[PDB]
Amino acid sequence: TAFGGRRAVPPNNSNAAEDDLPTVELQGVVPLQEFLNVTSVHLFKERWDTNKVDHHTDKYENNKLIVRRGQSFYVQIDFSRPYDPRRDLFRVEYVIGRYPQENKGTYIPVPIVSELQSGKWGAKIVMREDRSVRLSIQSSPKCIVGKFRMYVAVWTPYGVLRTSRNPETDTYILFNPWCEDDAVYLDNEKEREEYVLNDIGVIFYGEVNDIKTRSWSYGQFEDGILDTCLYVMDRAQMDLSGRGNPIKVSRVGSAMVNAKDDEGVLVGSWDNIYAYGVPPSAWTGSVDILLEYRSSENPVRYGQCWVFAGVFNTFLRCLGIPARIVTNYFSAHDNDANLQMDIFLEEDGNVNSKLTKDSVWNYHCWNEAWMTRPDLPVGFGGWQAVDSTPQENSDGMYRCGPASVQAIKHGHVCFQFDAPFVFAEVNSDLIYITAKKDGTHVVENVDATHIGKLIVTKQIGGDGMMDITDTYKFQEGQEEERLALETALMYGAKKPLNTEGVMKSRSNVDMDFEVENAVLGKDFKLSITFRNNSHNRYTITAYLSANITFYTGVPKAEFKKETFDVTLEPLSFKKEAVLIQAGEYMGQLLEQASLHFFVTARINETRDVLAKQKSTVLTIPEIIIKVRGTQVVGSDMTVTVEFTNPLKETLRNVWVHLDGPGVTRPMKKMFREIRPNSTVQWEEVCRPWVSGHRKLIASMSSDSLRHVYGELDVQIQRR
Amino acid sequence: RTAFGGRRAVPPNNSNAAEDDLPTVELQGVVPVNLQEFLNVTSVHLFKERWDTNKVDHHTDKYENNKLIVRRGQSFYVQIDFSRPYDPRRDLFRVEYVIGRYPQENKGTYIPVPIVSELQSGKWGAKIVMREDRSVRLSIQSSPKCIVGKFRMYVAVWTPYGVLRTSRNPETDTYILFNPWCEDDAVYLDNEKEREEYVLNDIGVIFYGEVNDIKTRSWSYGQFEDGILDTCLYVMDRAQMDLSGRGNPIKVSRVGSAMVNAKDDEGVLVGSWDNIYAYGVPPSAWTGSVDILLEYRSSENPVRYGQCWVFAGVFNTFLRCLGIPARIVTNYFSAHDNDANLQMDIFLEEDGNVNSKLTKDSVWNYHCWNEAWMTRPDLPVGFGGWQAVDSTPQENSDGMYRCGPASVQAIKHGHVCFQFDAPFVFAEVNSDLIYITAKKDGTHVVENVDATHIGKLIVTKQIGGDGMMDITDTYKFQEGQEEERLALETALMYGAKKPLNTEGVMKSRSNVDMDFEVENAVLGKDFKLSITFRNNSHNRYTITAYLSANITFYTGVPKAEFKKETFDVTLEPLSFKKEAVLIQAGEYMGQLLEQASLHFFVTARINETRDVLAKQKSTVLTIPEIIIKVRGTQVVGSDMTVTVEFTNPLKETLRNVWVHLDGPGVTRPMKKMFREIRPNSTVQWEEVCRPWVSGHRKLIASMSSDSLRHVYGELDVQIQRR
């Protein structure tokens, strides 16, 4: 009635599933009681106790023992009678999954040893008193990460006597950045504090000339999160033997973030509508999302790049892998490994918006995970870029990474995973091409300094910005930068169009422009400058094209167009000012209030083309958070969330979100509608459970206006 | 309230079946004048008949397809008939090739072919070769990096006011394939005999059995059969493969191999190794890829069922049909599901017996995968050539997936740091068998290490013949050679792992040699197993040997131990003893699994030195083949009677006996059902075949029933021209 011919044992791919170890493995009475019996086990698992504090696992809102691999911890077993070294033999067993196998690392018998050897599992009797033995158990630093079952087995000559199933002794074993033998070892305490223990983050957005920031709750220590992270791997049917490998954990975990069909954590959406779900802009942290995923057991709607990164960062940090979110400004996504972004122009100099279909994202967020790379030559360990936002790679439409940031900076894109696609996000050239009326194409200009202009991440201790641009690229013009490019071209990166006659403009005319930062609903100026360094007189025709775009760069509508007839004297400089009125863009704005500007100019004399692009985001005023009360763990604190409608219009179905790990579970309030320029208030009583520097996080989302945030640093005390 | 698509300006162009509407007239700006003044296309001629020069010079004349089929990077001829003569002085026009619903010139999906004076190598262009009346003859050359698929063709006349274009015409739809004959193509093969075999041959040989009794059977690739080329494009559309990547042999292999083994409702074949196969066709019954691919096309669902050679057969059809040179390789004693470990464990009881409860991993008698030829511009120089691709899943760095393409060159040298999934393919052919005693107290003791069992022989069909070609030396250096030790070390540096330490197995206290032979037997017959000891040192010993004989699946997975024996041997110094065992038919009959595979463990404990000796061998019982006979004229278009004959070899009744007949270019795959076949009785199947392909052809047969299966037959026939 059917044979299992594919493999002798079904795959062991679920931490949730468990078998039943026999309590009596006898080999015949031939022909007990007088043998050792376990009366109880002590794990010293209190959060104030030495195990959790020495393992840095005391923050988890979990009452079970949680330790980190490759480091010893204490347990104590109580026997029916005193243990006798001569005549007695027992061992502790760690078991994970339904089909444990010692050679697969899922069945781990811990032997009593005299001395703990570094790198191997072992139990050292550190103390014998009465009917008790105090053990110092050390795990392997390559151990599988997950929740293990614990048993104590006494070996008699006729078999094994083992403890029965006890959910109270279930032990979680995580990655250990503190352990020098661990693949994820980070030798700097301040960095471990930030990249592993910090449960609050800062995401940078906006545009390079007006960097905006908002806080995100990672909430890795919150109740249920650790278990949800194991559930993610189980849903991925991730092989238990592979869960101790940070590379494979990063690889499989990141593929689970973006949902394809009914599998995955988040459904991606950039439609500015989001029917039947929550707008990506509404989320305040990962907790909300991961718990919803866990209970519904279905993908959560909806997410965008920073949301994918926030959730993946929670996953990494919760398991013990050092992780941070990075933001790349002017990002070339969906690049197919091409190092060129095309902008097509009409013959007169206008931007041909029919052909110009590729867009540079104002910003794009991805993650970096810290680990060694034993699959690559020496020198590629460290930060590995992993982008859970899909794009076409060699396998299809999927996440990219982990890719060694070291390999990327040097152009060694031949080393897995998906390196050429990450290299192209930060190194592409903007190519300006005239698409003539006869069918031919002429390359006019090359801008090699626009894409990947600034790459940032939150600073260690502090909400500040840390510029990590030089970790990804060498400085423009440097010899090493040209060598890195050449090496990349050798390994699959491509440049379809040859650009030689290009960039050698004999005009010597410099053009540039700036846009003042504006507040939503206000007017603002745009100045275009022209420098003539030659002793020649020129006449120029310039075009201004202004569009309302998504943060991805995708344009919705051109809201303003202008033409300028400039005459430049030899050795002269001149500024022209254009005035953009609130009435021109309002009513057409998309979420994030992003605007894009093209300024192209044709020099009538030399036939040369000058081009420049810039993005702008309109500043939307933040939400106000107020705290009234005492501010002590266990005792009440009143939090008031205040939002003032900035539009001269009625906001409808205004959802406000409150969050703060260790202070409050994520909550949300729904307001029928908000009158033009009127204010609403939300008062909630909070009973914090974590002391020290904490933070309150708020967000606002309506049928129209959204992507509005607020935050407050509070100081809670102990008892 | 809006709608907006903020992720991308244009939806992904990932279906070849989907198409846009190009305007027949497209003007811009003020006018006022006669449009009739400009050229007009009255007709287009592709010279796409099968005897014509386009298909013959492009080596596409074998496809049972009436549309034009050319290969990239090589010129072909077309003729355009206008409404009036072409005036070089005043007319301007170009040919356009378009693919998908969202064509873009910078993505290679919209291709405007310009009229040029001279065709440059590597670029698209059309050269006017003849002017005559209202007609112009062009020599069109495509780029060698061109996307592979079915393009729509249009002719566009340029006027100062815009474009005038022909209308949609399915008759001019042109297929552009990979070109192994073009030097600039990534899949370039520099020799005609290799091209003939690896691209043009539609019949193949699959080697199976076990290393000491290599069995062979024929498989129909049928890449030129009606409907196949279209089904291959359909596979890529089902995979939602971006049209821009279908011109990259690496991505096509990567995505295509992932579609072979169906996970849920996506993919071509549902894998099953249950010996039952209820609600499907047993993997053993298939005679080729045609049957499977067409069923997948019409049902639009995964086909039940397949195993490794079936996946390879089908994937081989896919690659050859598109133009990527490909072959199937068989690895004898394959370490699949290795997780990159270079060690396979066998656990022994304390006495010396095999611990069958702890021994859970198995070596496959054989395992088939594919090799595809292409350059590897994503890797350092020297890694081009054959690339291994295994569509039979196993855990790799991404999950349970196919592995490859991995450069066979990198695998041979241990450079497993190069994508894709290299460590896992390297371990299929390089693992060590580690014999370990699991003592009653809980500890483990490494007794022996056999580094010569796994990947003992790797073969493939020879060029221009049905014999086998030993390619073992392409995957690995000679045992005990310098280069082989360095390869192993390099692999360990990049991810390959050896959990147990085997320096201490210097317990090479092999003064005594042991080995055994199992004679080749026929199903139903008794056979012998001969164990042979050898005392190569001055000494007398008391040995206890154990024999464990099991019925297994071809994958090595055991179903039952059907025979156990102990031997107390005492051999004198410098003397060699021999022991023969007789296995009677009654001991295994009635318990056999499909493929009639048997596995033998022979373990020995030398009482004196406490040493352990161990060896293992597999055996497959031979089954009589199906007899194919033909009587007729043997010329295309004319009838030929084929008779399939099967004689029940079992002295019991075979029930629901399905017989299958196949032969590309001779017959469409067919199958006959037989209620039941009496013990030792014979049945005959007769069929009238009207062949359509001349030259050397082959008839292929297979048999499958409720119990007995994995029975084949074949016959080389010669069809003639007329």
Curated annotation (Swiss-Prot), chain A:
Glycans are attached at N604. Its cofactor is Ca(2+). Ca(2+) binds at N427, D429, E476, E481. Changing G583S: In FA13AD; no effect on intracellular protein abundance; increased protein-glutamine gamma-glutamyltransferase activity; no effect on alpha-2-antiplasmin to fibrin cross-linking activity; no effect on fibrin alpha chain and gamma chain cross-linking activity; decreased clot fiber thickness. Residues 1-31 form a propeptide. The gene is F13A1. One of its GO terms (cellular component) is platelet alpha granule lumen. Factor XIII is activated by thrombin and calcium ion to a transglutaminase that catalyzes the formation of gamma-glutamyl-epsilon-lysine cross-links between fibrin chains, thus stabilizing the fibrin clot. Also cross-link alpha-2-plasmin inhibitor, or fibronectin, to the alpha chains of fibrin. Changing S404L: In FA13AD; uncertain significance. This is Coagulation factor XIII A chain. The keyword Transmembrane helix does not apply. It is linked to Factor XIII subunit A deficiency: An autosomal recessive hematologic disorder characterized by a life-long bleeding tendency, impaired wound healing and spontaneous abortion in affected women. Changing A337D: In FA13AD; uncertain significance. Changing L520P: In FA13AD; mild; decreased intracellular protein abundance; loss of protein-glutamine gamma-glutamyltransferase activity; decreased alpha-2-antiplasmin to fibrin cross-linking activity; loss of fibrin gamma chain cross-linking activity; decreased clot fiber thickness. The active site is at C305, H364, D387. It is an enzyme of class 2 (transferase). Changing V641I: In allele F13A*2A and allele F13A*2B. The activation peptide is released by thrombin. The keyword Glycoprotein applies. Disulfide bonds: none annotated. It catalyses: L-glutaminyl-[protein] + L-lysyl-[protein] = [protein]-L-lysyl-N(6)-5-L-glutamyl-[protein] + NH4(+). Changing P555L: In allele F13A*1A, allele F13A*2A and allele F13*(2)A.
UniProtKB/Swiss-Prot annotation, chain B:
Keywords: Acetylation, Acyltransferase, Blood coagulation, Calcium, Cytoplasm, Disease variant, Glycoprotein, Hemostasis, Metal-binding, Secreted, Transferase, Zymogen. Belongs to the transglutaminase superfamily. Transglutaminase family. Pfam families: Transglut_C, Transglut_core, Transglut_N. Changing A340D: In FA13AD; uncertain significance. This is Coagulation factor XIII A chain. The activation peptide is released by thrombin. Its EC number is 2.3.2.13.
